[PDB]
Each structure stands twice: as structure tokens, then as C-alpha cells.
Design an enzyme around this catalytic site. Structure first.
Site, PDB file in Angstrom:
ATOM      1  N   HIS A  63       0.889  -0.984  -0.015  1.00 39.70           N
ATOM      2  CA  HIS A  63      -0.147  -0.219  -0.011  1.00 39.70           C
ATOM      3  C   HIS A  63       0.798   1.238  -0.048  1.00 39.70           C
ATOM      4  O   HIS A  63       1.715   1.358   1.031  1.00 39.70           O
ATOM      5  CB  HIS A  63      -0.856  -0.238   1.131  1.00 39.70           C
ATOM      6  N   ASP A  79      -2.177   9.186   3.628  1.00 45.05           N
ATOM      7  CA  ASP A  79      -2.693   7.589   3.284  1.00 45.05           C
ATOM      8  C   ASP A  79      -3.726   7.969   2.307  1.00 45.05           C
ATOM      9  O   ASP A  79      -4.865   8.318   3.080  1.00 45.05           O
ATOM     10  CB  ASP A  79      -2.533   7.143   4.318  1.00 45.05           C
ATOM     11  N   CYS A 117      -3.958   3.609  -4.746  1.00 48.18           N
ATOM     12  CA  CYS A 117      -3.232   4.228  -3.752  1.00 48.18           C
ATOM     13  C   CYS A 117      -2.169   4.760  -4.611  1.00 48.18           C
ATOM     14  O   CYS A 117      -1.725   6.056  -4.391  1.00 48.18           O
ATOM     15  CB  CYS A 117      -2.745   3.175  -2.793  1.00 48.18           C
TER      16      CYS A 117
END
Length: 192
Positions: A63, A79, A117
Site C-alpha cells: 500500500h 494515506d 493508492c
């Protein structure tokens, strides 16, 4: 495909997209079996660092998040999965920063990642970098709010299809050729 796997950027892809946008030859970071590789020289020099978290012996994909350097001894963590997720990496990443530094998580909302992401790091991550380092920077809250809103608005009107289609089109090489501030601008200017 060298740059994209499924709809995610590989390490090669991340380097390639930053090179194509005009940020030169950047250094990225990672977290392998829970232990960070973060070059702080390159972080301070770049102003940011994409970090591939969650990797290990049996995990090449993970990620992506974005480490951001602000003014002074302030650092930020973006994030794409949202504030809680980032708070998950806060400590282990903070201990890698210079003595006296502080690391705060950008408080953006959950539920907007959509498995993109790497794309988000290369776009909203950069826009967060630019926002936090401009003359009159917004508050951390305003930046988080704004990022949440931007992700939501870009996903509207077939955004997921447009993004995933572009990523698949640039899986091996990127089109030419003006430099860009962020990945959304690159996408929009190279087919979307």
C-alpha cells in the site's frame, strides 16, 4: 508491464511517473517486514517520498503512502485509505525522521482509495505537498478536507474507469510531453 500491475504502480512505475512529470530521479521508500527504508537526505531534498508499505518476503505489492516534509521540522503522512490507516504507520515512520521532528497524519476520509493508492500518492499526495508548503498554508484539517473532497470529485462521473483506463494505457510507457505539477494533470493532458 513495467510501470503498472493490475491498476497499481510498481516501484518502477512510481519512479517513472515522477520522472515524466519533471521531478527528476526520485528516491522512494518502503516498509519491509515492518522495518522502514527511508532516505532522510532524499526526503528533505525532494520535499516528499512515496513509501511502499506492507511489503515483505512474500509480498511485492503493498500500500503506497506519501511522506511529506513541511516548513521547519514538520512532516506529514498522506494515506489514500484515510486517517486511521495512516495512523497505522505513524510511529514506525516517525522514528525514522530527524531528532526533534514531528509527524502528523493528514486527516483525509476513508472509503475513497478504490485500489488506486499509487495514483493518489502521485497526484493528491503531490497536491498536499504543494498546499502545505505554499506561502499561506492551510491548516492540517483544511488540507485533509480538501484532499477528501478532491478524491471524491475525481471519482465522480466515471472517474474510476477514466483513471484505470489511463493507468492501463501507460503500463509500459508514458506519452509526451509537457511537465506537470501532479499525476491528475499528467493524466488529463495525456488522455482523459
Amino acid at each position: 508491464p513495467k510501470y503498472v500491475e493490475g491498476v497499481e504502480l510498481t516501484q518502477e512505475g512510481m519512479h517513472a511517473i515522477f520522472a515524466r512529470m519533471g521531478y527528476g530521479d526520485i528516491t522512494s521508500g518502503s516498509i519491509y517486514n515492518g522495518v522502514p527504508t527511508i532516505d532522510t537526505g532524499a526526503l528533505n531534498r525532494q520535499g516528499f517520498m512515496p513509501v511502499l508499505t506492507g511489503v515483505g518476503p512474500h509480498r511485492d505489492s503493498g500500500h503506497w503512502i506519501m511522506l511529506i516534509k513541511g516548513p521547519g521540522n514538520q512532516y506529514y503522512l498522506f494515506d489514500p485509505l484515510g486517517k486511521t490507516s495512516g495512523e497505522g504507520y505513524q510511529n514506525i515512520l516517525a522514528a525514522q525522521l530527524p531528532m526533534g521532528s514531528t509527524l502528523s497524519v493528514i486527516p483525509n476520509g476513508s472509503g475513497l482509495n478504490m485500489g488506486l493508492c499509487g495514483y493518489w500518492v502521485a497526484s493528491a499526495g503531490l497536491r498536499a505537498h504543494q498546499a502545505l508548503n505554499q506561502h499561506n498554508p492551510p491548516t492540517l484539517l483544511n488540507v485533509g478536507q480538501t484532499i477528501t473532497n478532491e478524491m471524491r470529485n475525481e471519482l465522480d462521473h466515471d472517474g474510476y474507469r477514466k483513471i484505470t483506463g489511463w493507468l492501463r494505457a501507460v503500463a509500459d510507457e508514458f506519452p509526451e510531453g509537457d511537465p506537470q505539477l501532479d499525476g491528475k494533470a499528467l493524466r488529463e493532458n495525456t488522455e482523459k
